[PDB]
Design a protein around this ligand. Structure first.
Ligand SMILES: *[C@@H]1O[C@H](CO)[C@@H](O[C@@H]2O[C@H](CO)[C@@H](O)[C@H](O)[C@H]2NC(C)=O)[C@H](O)[C@H]1NC(C)=O
Ligand SMILES: CCCCC/C=C\C/C=C\CCCCCCCC(=O)O
Ligand SMILES: CC(=O)N[C@@H]1[C@@H](O)[C@H](O)[C@@H](CO)O[C@H]1O
Ligand SMILES: CC(=O)N[C@@H]1[C@@H](O)[C@H](O)[C@@H](CO)O[C@H]1O
Ligand SMILES: *[C@@H]1O[C@H](CO)[C@@H](O)[C@H](O)[C@H]1NC(C)=O
Ligand SMILES: *[C@@H]1O[C@H](CO)[C@@H](O)[C@H](O)[C@H]1NC(C)=O
Ligand SMILES: *[C@@H]1O[C@H](CO)[C@@H](O)[C@H](O)[C@H]1NC(C)=O
Ligand SMILES: *[C@@H]1O[C@H](CO)[C@@H](O)[C@H](O)[C@H]1NC(C)=O
Ligand SMILES: *[C@@H]1O[C@H](CO)[C@@H](O)[C@H](O)[C@H]1NC(C)=O
Ligand SMILES: *[C@@H]1O[C@H](CO)[C@@H](O)[C@H](O)[C@H]1NC(C)=O
Ligand SMILES: *[C@@H]1O[C@H](CO)[C@@H](O)[C@H](O)[C@H]1NC(C)=O
Lengths: 198, 49, 279
């Protein structure tokens, strides 16, 4: 998954696990068990006008911090005082969202940055992205180094009788080593046996 | 502010440290704590500040 | 199109025991001929689950708003396709985002936007004798849907909708979890032949889907189908017949289980490591 947004230049440090601040508290929270990358680049040449760019908003008030990967798009009046506001936005009752003012003559810390957060998992389930690596043929009954969907190893591959459910790709033994694998092109199950013995 | 060679030191005591009030009027380019986690600062209580 | 139904009788709640029900595959790894210890959100063994029905003749259309504490085990015994889906959310009143999973007579629809749900959301099937058919007629769930974020619609089909008269022939079990903005659904279908009181046995639920919805969920509600025909005069709020279905609700907690995989890779038994000292 790819999450995209635009923030201020000073707040790019807040896109990380275990951070505090208004972006990490009220707008976008990363899990502590995060796997993936965060990418950010300056976009002062596209998101700022000479009069100002008030298209990008952010939440400034909230009753509690967000949960990881949770999104709040509500626009109820935030009661900061000791009186019901009845949704009229008076004194001590604020509108929750405010606007970034992006002008091309801002300091670098106030210029807009575009942020993309890529999130994925590795080496447990069937995958469909892969990289630029190129495949080879299947050599069975010999000692080979293998790379199956990114999982590397060494051993002997043989035809198997195990039968995986459709949501399974790898098989593990009691010592938690991978001993079976589904070939990603022929969809056949193979057993992986070590090479040294005796 | 003071010059770095004659930096200033101020004592802080007897006040609630609700730093969320800095969200509207301040934007810091560097913020790093040592010995504590930023997500725990709201539950703690500080000595000799 | 949104009505407050009537002609409903009063009754206290009913409870039942869960005889080692509600176990699911906790990863996507294949294991064979082994005993594996796992900690996760499970439904404890011999738990007190709540029982809801809907038999008319007495009318009983149960669909209250129930909590969604940490996850939900949901089971449904039916013969004529009465439970159609659920709605999940916190306020369910268009001030916050909500998730809707529904089964029309033709598609499965998943939508995560801002709904204004009714006090009594339902669907409705109409029965003609002149024409030889039960047909899907009403869909009265929400009034508005403004700022949608996620949407999925399955390939078209057509269900049966025909009202049977035998015994409960289909058991469908679901586990709903909500973590890191992912709504995970595990599911299992089983053929049964039963009259009441959710049965005993062991079957492990397999992973169905992970939806990236990213909303807060604290309550949920079930969507039932109505029956209207030439024998239901009423106007539109008293002229309805319920049907026959039952569903049971229980809540998950973090437990340690010991699962048993046979040689074919299927989970066939489990031990709840905190039920007794024996376990
Ligand atoms: C992946 O591509 C290979 C070819 O690059 C496909 O292999 C073909 O499989 C069919 C079986 O239905 C054989 O009749 C062909 O001779 C195969 N081609 C070659 C070049 O060996 C394979 O089917 C593709 N993967 C999928 C899922 O279709
Ligand atoms: C006199 C000053 C108050 C002294 C309070 C003492 C301890 C409180 C602990 C931490 C305060 C951190 C303030 C900076 C908040 C920046 C938030 C952010 O954008 O990341
Ligand atoms: C120049 C400027 O914006 N000053 C701000 C003002 O806008 C705001 O109302 C007040 C309370 O937060 O703090 C200060
Ligand atoms: C008990 C209850 O639900 N009362 C509500 C009322 O507050 C609301 O104004 C009205 C709108 O039609 O619907 C009813
Ligand atoms: C979920 O909604 C409830 C509404 O009762 C709210 O109190 C709670 O704070 C929300 N979740 C979070 C993490 O704030
Ligand atoms: C349904 O009943 C509720 C009160 O429980 C009421 O607020 C609402 O306006 C009623 N709506 C209709 C259509 O009767
Ligand atoms: C379930 O809990 C209720 C709570 O009062 C209790 O009355 C009922 O006896 C319990 N059921 C079982 C089977 O323990
Ligand atoms: C069922 O509801 C979905 C929700 O929009 C709709 O797209 C679909 O067309 C409906 N079913 C039929 C048969 O029209
Ligand atoms: C059956 O007849 C009913 C009217 O009684 C009509 O509404 C419906 O569309 C008809 N369906 C078919 C398949 O003829
Ligand atoms: C949701 O709807 C309201 C009112 O129609 C609108 O102000 C708001 O911008 C909408 N949400 C988004 C994300 O556009
Ligand atoms: C799986 O094992 C069962 C007994 O537990 C057996 O009846 C069945 O034939 C096996 N499946 C096969 C044939 O792979």
């Amino acid at each position: 998954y790819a999450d995209s947004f635009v923030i201020r230049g000073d707040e790019v440090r807040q896109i990380a696990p275990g951070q505090t601040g208004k972006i990490a508290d009220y707008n976008y929270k990363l899990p502590d068990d995060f796997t993936g990358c965060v990418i950010a680049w300056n976009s002062n040449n596209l998101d700022s006008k000479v009069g100002g760019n008030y298209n990008y908003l952010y939440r400034l008030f909230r009753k509690s911090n967000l949960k990881p990967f949770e999104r709040d798009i509500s626009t109820e009046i935030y009661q900061a005082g000791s009186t019901p506001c009845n949704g009229v936005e008076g004194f001590n009752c604020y509108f929750p969202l405010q606007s970034y003012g992006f002008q091309p003559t801002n300091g670098v810390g106030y210029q807009p940055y575009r942020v993309v957060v890529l999130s994925f998992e590795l080496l447990h389930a069937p995958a469909t992205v892969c990289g630029p690596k190129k495949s080879t043929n299947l050599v069975k009954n010999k000692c080979v180094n293998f790379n199956f969907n990114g999982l590397t190893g060494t051993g002997v591959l043989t035809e198997s009788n195990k039968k995986f459910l459709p949501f399974q790709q790898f098989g593990r033994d009691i010592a938690d080593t991978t001993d079976a694998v589904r070939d990603p092109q022929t969809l056949e199950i193979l057993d992986i046996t070590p090479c040294s013995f005796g | 502010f003071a010059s770095v060679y004659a930096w200033n030191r101020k004592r802080i005591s007897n006040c609630v440290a609700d730093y969320s009030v800095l969200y509207n009027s301040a934007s810091f380019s560097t913020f790093k704590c040592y010995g504590v986690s930023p997500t725990k600062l709201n539950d703690l209580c500080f000595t000799n500040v | 199109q949104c009505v407050n139904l009537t002609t409903r009788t009063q009754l206290p709640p009913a409870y039942t025991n869960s005889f080692t029900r509600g176990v699911y595959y906790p990863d996507k790894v294949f294991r064979s001929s082994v005993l594996h210890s796992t900690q996760d959100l499970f439904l404890p063994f011999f738990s007190n689950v709540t029982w809801f029905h809907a038999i008319h003749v007495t009318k009983r259309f149960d669909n209250p708003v129930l909590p969604f504490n940490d996850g939900v085990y949901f089971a449904s015994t039916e013969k004529s396709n009465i439970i159609r889906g659920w709605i999940f959310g916190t306020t369910l009143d268009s001030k916050t985002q909500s998730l809707l999973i529904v089964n029309n007579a033709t598609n499965v629809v998943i939508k995560v936007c801002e709904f204004q749900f009714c006090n009594d959301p339902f669907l409705g099937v109409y029965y003609h004798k002149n024409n030889k058919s039960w047909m899907e007629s009403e869909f009265r769930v929400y009034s508005s849907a403004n700022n949608c974020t996620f949407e999925y619609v399955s390939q078209p089909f057509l269900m049966d909708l025909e009202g049977k008269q035998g015994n409960f022939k289909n058991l469908r079990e679901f586990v709903f979890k909500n973590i890191d903005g992912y709504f995970k659904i595990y599911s299992k279908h089983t053929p049964i032949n039963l009259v009441r009181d959710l049965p005993q046995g062991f079957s492990a639920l397999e992973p169905l889907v992970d939806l990236p919805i990213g909303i807060n969920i604290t309550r949920f509600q079930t969507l039932l189908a109505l029956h209207r025909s030439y024998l239901t005069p009423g106007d539109s709020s008293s002229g309805w017949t319920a049907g026959a279905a039952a569903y049971y609700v229980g809540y998950l907690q973090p437990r340690t289980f010991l699962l048993k995989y046979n040689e074919n890779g299927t989970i066939t038994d489990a031990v709840d490591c905190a039920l007794d000292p024996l376990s």
